Amino acid sequence: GTTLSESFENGIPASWKTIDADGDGHGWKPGNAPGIAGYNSNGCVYSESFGLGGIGVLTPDNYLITPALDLPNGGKLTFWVCAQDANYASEHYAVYASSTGNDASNFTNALLEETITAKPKAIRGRIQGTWRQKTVDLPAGTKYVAFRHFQSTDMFYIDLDEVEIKANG
Ligand SMILES: [Ca+2]
Numbered sequence: 045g046t047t048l049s050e051s052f053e054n055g056i057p058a059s060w061k062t063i064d065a066d067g068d069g070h071g072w073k074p075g076n077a078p079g080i081a082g083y084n085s086n087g088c089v090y091s092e093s094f095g096l097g098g099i100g101v102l103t104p105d106n107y108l109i110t111p112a113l114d115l116p117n118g119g120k121l122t123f124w125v126c127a128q129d130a131n132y133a134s135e136h137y138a139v140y141a142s143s144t145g146n147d148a149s150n151f152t153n154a155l156l157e158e159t160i161t162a163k164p165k166a167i168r169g170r171i172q173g174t175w176r177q178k179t180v181d182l183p184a185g186t187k188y189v190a191f192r193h194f195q196s197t198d199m200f201y202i203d204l205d206e207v208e209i210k211a212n213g
């Protein structure tokens with residue numbers, strides 16, 4: 045079955061689907077160095093809970109969804125995530141599998157759900173959040189994977205990079 049490897053070095057391919065479910069006009073977006081460097085690479089994607097330039101506080105419910113997948117005996121997903129700004133790091137997200145369609149309502153099996161945590165002597169810390177790697181088992185018959193930024197507000201960005209799916213298959 046499917047191997048998928050996406051480094052986001054040239055944005056979000058049209059074969060991926062984005063859903064701005066909350067309807068504010070802000071969804072998952074391409075990021076690149078120097079503003080928004082990827083993991084060991086130039087490009088990534090990001091989603092905002094606060095926008096620069098007067099945009100202000102947001103309440104995202106934003107989906108980034110893979111192309112269709114062929115996983116008759118399941119597979120393994122890995123990806124990298126961080127908080128863009130270590131002082132505003134508490135972004136919440138979940139990863140879902142659908143066996144059916146690729147609408148928001150088809151993503152109900154949360155495989156992974158978490159709020160990012162920032163990593164007594166006074167010491168200078170990183171400006172940007174540390175990249176962490178996540179590994180998720182994908183059930184047999186999974187056709188789409190969704191990354192959902194939601195139940196988040198008034199932090200900064202969540203960044204996502206280097207998505208790999210290996211079929212068992
Ligand atoms: Ca990248």
Ligand SMILES: [Ca+2]
Nearest residue numbers: 064066068070
């Ligand atoms: Ca939105």
